[PDB]
């Protein structure tokens, strides 16, 4: 498994 919260946070908040 892998958290959608974790992956989406990085996706929407990357520089």
């Amino acid at each position, epitope marked *: 498994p*892998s958290k*959608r*919260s974790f*992956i*989406e*946070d990085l*996706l*929407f*908040n990357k520089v």
Partner: antibody, heavy 132, light 109 residues
Framework: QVQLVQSGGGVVQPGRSLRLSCAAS????????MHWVRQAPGKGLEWVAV????????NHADSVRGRFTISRDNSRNMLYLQMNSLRRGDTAVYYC?????????????????????????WGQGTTVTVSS | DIVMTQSPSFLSASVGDRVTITCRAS??????LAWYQQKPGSAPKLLIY???TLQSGVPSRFSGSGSETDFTLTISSLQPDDFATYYC??????????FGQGTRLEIKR
């Protein structure tokens, strides 16, 4: 049976504000990101905003950043666009759209299944006319 | 932001013809490119995603190809239902998304 039904547009004066609604049904609304896209009379499609499955993350296009706010209420299967500081250039048909999931995945599989695969179901569109 | 440039802006064909419309990204977008069809007064319809895979329900005469910066939509035997405006859309820079300017496919006479 998968469907988006929009309501709430019309004529508004510049500077004023409007809120568009988009009611989803036939699918697990809270499992998918949702988008707004608009089309000014006689012109092409312009992407407006996206919101993540549970409302925590969101992004708006530069043309509307700071004026429009996307939001969602998953307990009522509702997507919203709050449109403030309206300009004549915001005159368009506004569509809500569901994020498409790659056919080979029945559940969320990060970038394998979601985000990158377009938008499969669309609302009927709402006309917003910004004018003095 | 990535700019998508469709060509041509307008083109004419008859029923039975083959039609190719292209779309170019201002930088590489891998294969994260979708195509849509739209008729006046209706919402856009998703035709192809991930550059080449056909959306369920879309006739097989539609096909997509391309990668990195150059992409094409091909309709192999034009039918009356196919006259419309077509848009490409890149999703590589998710969560910001951009559309091409559209291609209008009208009836030759």
């Amino acid at each position: 049976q998968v469907q988006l039904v929009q309501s709430g547009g019309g004529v508004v004066q510049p500077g004023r504000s409007l809120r568009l609604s988009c009611a989803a049904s036939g699918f697990n609304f809270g499992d998918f990101g949702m988008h707004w896209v608009r089309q000014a009379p006689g012109k092409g499609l312009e992407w407006v905003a996206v919101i993540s499955y549970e409302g925590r993350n969101k992004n708006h296009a530069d043309s509307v950043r700071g004026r429009f706010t996307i939001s969602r209420d998953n307990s009522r299967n509702m997507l919203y666009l709050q449109m403030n500081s309206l300009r004549r250039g915001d005159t368009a048909v506004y569509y809500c759209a569901k994020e498409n999931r790659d056919r080979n995945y029945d559940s969320w599989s990060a970038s394998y299944s979601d985000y990158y695969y377009g938008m499969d179901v669309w609302g009927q569109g709402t006309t917003v006319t910004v004018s003095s | 932001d990535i700019v998508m440039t469709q060509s041509p802006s307008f083109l004419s064909a008859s029923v039975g013809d083959r039609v190719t419309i292209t779309c170019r990204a201002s930088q590489g977008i891998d294969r994260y490119l979708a195509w849509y069809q739209q008729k006046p007064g209706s919402a856009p319809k998703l035709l192809i995603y991930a550059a080449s895979t056909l959306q369920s329900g879309v006739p097989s005469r539609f096909s997509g190809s391309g990668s990195e910066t150059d992409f094409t939509l091909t309709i192999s035997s034009l039918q009356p239902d196919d006259f419309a405006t077509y848009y490409c859309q890149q999703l590589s820079t998710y969560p910001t998304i951009t559309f091409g300017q559209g291609t209008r496919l009208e009836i030759k006479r």
